[PDB]
Symmetry: D2
């Protein structure tokens, strides 16, 4: 229908030049797709109650950040328990349950050259409490990342390390840090003090571009909606900043004081949710996909080959979603790197993977709880149907839609290799 092609900036998406795309942007063209940029909310006195945390999950919070620069281990263990209680209060309805990752943001090296002794104790605390992500403060070289990985020990092998770039050395040694990290955080607060304030935007755009090229998650952080710490509505520069972080290519956007100590934590999450949906519909996929395809190297990895074929197929039919079965989240990450307009519904049995895939833009994790079927092909079909039923319940899919299904040839991680065009019934 004509109405379908007037929504989600589709006239602007069909434009032949970026200039014509801008000219065709319409304030009356409503966003239809689900919000794909994840929201990281910092936990503190304003967002610690179980009842307030339930409201933040409903507003769109995907990752809860624990800032280990403040508070004791007892304080952070209580934060973890309240987050998990609020998250599990919706587990009674598996088709609508939303996993929420828990990220530990370290205190940092301070005046020291490498990993501090408090960071070693805090990292061990994180492993013992089952955190999913580490936001490693003041990463200056590859050996800083290796020190964090060593401090996590053998039990913390599955924890993602997102390196925070906060100074000139981190910006200069970016390539070596990105190579050994799982992703990056553009920590603009310290970065704006370490380098001239008027240069932070160049560092943010460079790091986002390089992370997008590498297919690794990138978080834009600090002062995005600062004025909402005390005021009910943000400034015109703040809404523009959030929108531009999404247009730059950020996988995640973050709230610090807005959710930890401010007076509008739920509204700050709602505002980031609303801006991100508008900005995602304004993305010029025509040039973006072409450039991501052209820049990505040739590959002999079947997961990598299936991912590009599935994204290409999704664009060809305007697929409502790409449903992917994943154990570690990697198959969903490789689909996410090509920035499909189709939502990536990732069905997994790993609760940790379901929490961690929020780091990748456009990945909507579904945690499958059923015990395995005796026949593997039937267990695979049951999970795909769970993805279709959750998608229908949440508004991602309707009868008549086309979906791309990405599965593998045997159980276990690393064997994705099948792309299937499916009609929703």
């Amino acid at each position: 229908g004509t109405a379908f092609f007037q929504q989600q900036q589709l006239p602007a998406a069909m434009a032949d030049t970026f200039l014509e795309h801008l000219c065709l942007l319409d304030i009356d063209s409503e966003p239809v797709a689900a919000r794909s940029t994840s929201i990281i909310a910092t936990i503190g006195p304003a967002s610690r109650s179980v009842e307030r945390l339930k409201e933040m999950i409903k507003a769109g919070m995907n990752i809860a950040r624990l800032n280990f620069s403040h508070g004791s281990h007892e304080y952070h263990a209580e934060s973890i328990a309240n987050v998990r209680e609020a998250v599990e209060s919706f587990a009674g309805s598996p088709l609508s349950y939303r996993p929420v990752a828990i990220a530990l943001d370290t205190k940092g090296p301070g005046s020291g050259p490498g990993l501090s002794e408090q960071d070693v104790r805090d990292l061990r605390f994180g492993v013992e409490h089952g955190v999913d992500i580490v936001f490693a403060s003041f990463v200056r070289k590859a050996s800083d990342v290796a020190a964090v990985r060593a401090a996590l020990g053998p039990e913390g092998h599955g924890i993602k390390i997102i390196s925070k770039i906060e100074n000139h050395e981190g910006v200069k040694r970016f390539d070596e840090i990105l190579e050994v990290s799982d992703g990056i955080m553009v920590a603009r607060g310290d970065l704006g003090i370490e380098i001239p304030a008027e240069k932070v935007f160049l560092a943010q755009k460079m790091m986002i571009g390089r992370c997008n090229l590498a297919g690794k998650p990138v978080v834009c952080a600090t002062q995005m909606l600062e004025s909402m710490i005390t005021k009910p509505r943000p400034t015109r520069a703040e809404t523009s900043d959030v929108a531009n972080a999404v247009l730059d290519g950020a996988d995640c956007i973050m709230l610090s004081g807005e959710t930890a100590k401010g007076n509008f934590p739920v509204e700050a999450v709602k505002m980031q949710h609303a801006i991100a949906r508008e900005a995602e519909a304004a993305v010029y996929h025509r040039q973006l996909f072409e450039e991501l395809r052209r820049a990505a190297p040739l590959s002999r990895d079947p997961t990598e080959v299936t991912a590009i074929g599935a994204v290409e197929a999704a664009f060809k039919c305007c697929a409502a979603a790409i449903i992917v079965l994943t154990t570690t989240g990697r198959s969903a990450q490789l689909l996410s790197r090509y920035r499909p307009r189709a939502a990536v519904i990732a069905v997994t049995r790993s609760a940790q993977a379901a929490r961690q895939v929020h780091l990748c833009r456009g990945v909507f994790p579904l945690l499958y709880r059923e015990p395995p079927e005796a026949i593997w092909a039937d267990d695979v079909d049951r999970r795909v149907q769970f993805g279709i039923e959750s998608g229908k319940l949440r508004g991602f899919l309707r009868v008549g839609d086309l979906v791309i299904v990405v599965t593998g040839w045997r159980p276990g991680s690393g064997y994705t290799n099948i792309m299937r065009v499916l009609s929703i019934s």
Copy 2:
């Protein structure tokens, strides 16, 4: 992984270029073609190419389609030509490495205002003798194609009608003719007499472009290697002409007098084979695929969606082949329209489809005659393995290579919706 030697062959340095101008500058006479020749050769059968022994030599040289010119000779003469082609083709049935299906095409005498009485009798002869293709002479409007289609009686609706554009009216009414035809022949002999000779190249390039856009086969015909009727080597203009027809986008190239009455019929086939291989490696796939992708409309047909995803996947891993299961040839045709560098190995139970897919560039048919398995998924696996073992036998594949496999979710034609990445073992 593949080596520097691999990336120096088949014009791969020229294929990686960022502009068409840089692609031209990087073409190398020392870069040898590795892929199998994908542009089919149509050879006209006449006194110089009628004997079973001569036909066996032409099959070995590369003839894929045998053309019977009904402008000369009786029905008895053409029935003997058909029998000799079939005898020469079946003389290699014992060896899997040498067996190659050969299509039989009937070229009509022509019109008078519409379908002539002799054309009705000749078309009826074609149906009775099981011809695969009709090259319909002097098509000027859509109603001429409908007359040929109606003349293919009740038993011949499976025969492909390739409309010959030979005059100004056919060129002007091209869109309506292509819409109702299976493909087109740029019949340059009469076209060069009906329109100014210096305008034939414009008509050829326009029709080839429109056929490529429509995803329908296009044949370049007449005087391609004319001097080879009496001389053992062609002129510099003739080799250039064959190469440029392949670079323009022609699915097939044809020999008329060169093979029907000339002194070097086998040598003419060998020459077309050698030039086509060189020209196919020089194709600028980078821009070609992007433009075929951008110009092809969005589709909700799973075969069309699977085909683009499979071609995209083949380019990503430099796949040795795309193995497709097809009953009518349609799934292989939709892969062929995106001009993959990988060979399209079409496994079919239909002898007619195996002969007719020679009309589509890069489709290498395999006729499969094993009795069907009781379990459909096992029958599918057996045909995919048949394609891999014939591929290994003929030099298309080695252990360690990657292939793309295109199949459907249920038996019967029209259900292609699956693309798999397979490692050859």
Copy 3:
């Protein structure tokens, strides 16, 4: 690499490391982003104009001199507050501070004066206070009118009529502040000289999360039309009370320049804030960094592909001159202009080279600050007897001011744009000159 090798050997590797030149030579926008470098210093003069609102914090002649030195190009008088006597005193103080630098003509900086109207309020069209304020503007010689709440083409025609016969030279920049203005944008732009994205009211009239779409759409359409566009309101809001802006504020300024804005504005930050000079300095610093990060390779290609064919010699000469400037990395394009139009047509193609506009019109010299990358030089000398000699003297005045301000160095290439006969509308010549 071969397309820059001889020029890299000539100008040096250090030249090609500054002003984001490695990022500018990238083949894709993605590679351009990856190559942005915080250590690549901006070299070019700041091309995006700064509009500063005059108020109690920025009214004194001494404070205004500091703001001119910090980079203020246009002084905005907000007629929503203050009396005619108050605004006349503000105008006089701006003119006094501007003329305090007139002793040195090769370095003098013109400053435009803009009148921002109160608006229609609850009314349907032009209010009676707006008619009195517009007459005040004509009587006091203002250069620009920022017309509040423009909702249709007839609103800008009413403003033009209220300016009368004597205000024909005044530029009307229409402020888009509501849903109707956004929806009727094309008809408003057609009859206006330019647009202001008035984000304050716009963010109240439409959902706050949609303002960025309206800003980007209007900037794109103004760039396509070749007409000036101003980005306004809350750009450095926190600097009203703090000496340093937030990370969202610096990002906002940078993104307005990257979107394609000709001008950026300061409101309460300069009118009533505690750091008016610091706010101007911050906008200056961010705009220079953002201008160097513009992806000229795709931008120029798209401006050419989108611009229709033209049989106007000024339009034809402008694209030829911008193309020539990119070919040699020209330090500047010196253009002779009477009304500012020839400089505006060069500016629409977004050259990296500075557009040094030599004019005898003091009003045109002030008004060309609306066009990005135009550096006005007011020529005060009496005419030569031979017209060709008068033209040459004006070109040499541009080269000498260019050398004395740092725009040009001996060995640089410059593009000179002139006409074949005196008077406006005859630009048709482009010359390549080597600086000696």
Copy 4:
């Protein structure tokens, strides 16, 4: 009506595929033929009357094949060409200069042969404009030809013929020291496999286009026309494709030297080239030539790109350039403008040699001088406009781009002007 002619619907297309789909056999070519025709002089094209007919059919360069005939035979051929060319000098606004090219015999079994030294000396003594140097294998072969031309032959253009594997492999070093290249497909098709010649032709044409140096496509282009009045479908396609590849010149060998239809062969190449030039996809071609050409601080180079860009912006009928050596016209030609490059020169040799560059129409200025330099310059621009109007290039109301310099003498072009006709 203007936008339906010269394949303008196909020229406006956003992709090459859409450009192909929009090619129209009913869209007539309007612009003058840009690709020069080199015709080989022999028994079938030696008479003054036959040569006059070939000049009217479109011959721009006369090739003397020194592989056959004596010096006396070639001197008579030169004299007949000059007599036929000067028979049209009575009308200066329509006079067509014709270059004379000497094609050497070659090294044979040997570097530079002793017969080649004598033939090159003959060429200098007889005032030839171009040398087509046979079997060039390395840069030192070009230097040997340059030395054999001596001090009296400094102005002669050396076009290196690439005829073997070594010439193809050492192409870059040969092009660097040559004025241009000839893709000599006859010997090349014997030295390398016949099925690889098209790759060598396309590579050399692309590299010459990138370098901004002339490239000639040669041998068997219309071969069958040696005995038949019409060419084959492969032959017309070959000529069209050489123009579409980017060749500056196309050549006729036996077709004009010994064939039964020399005038018809020239007419056929003229007709095909005009059709192929209108089918050129300028949208991508200009963008790629522009992107591939390096940045430059040479004012002639900078003015040339500004002028071609300006010509495309207004659909200029022509770019009128004042040139001494032909260089300013060559730098305009390298960007492949759709506008004709009308080169007004006083140098008769430069007027003949600029036929090597596609789209350059030389006008030999033989009008009285003006005392004031600026008036003399203006008069040459008016000469270009009047010849353009007379020959059909221009009409009243058209826009032209005029390219001149700031002071006399070669190497000072730095001005581009937009001018309205009449």
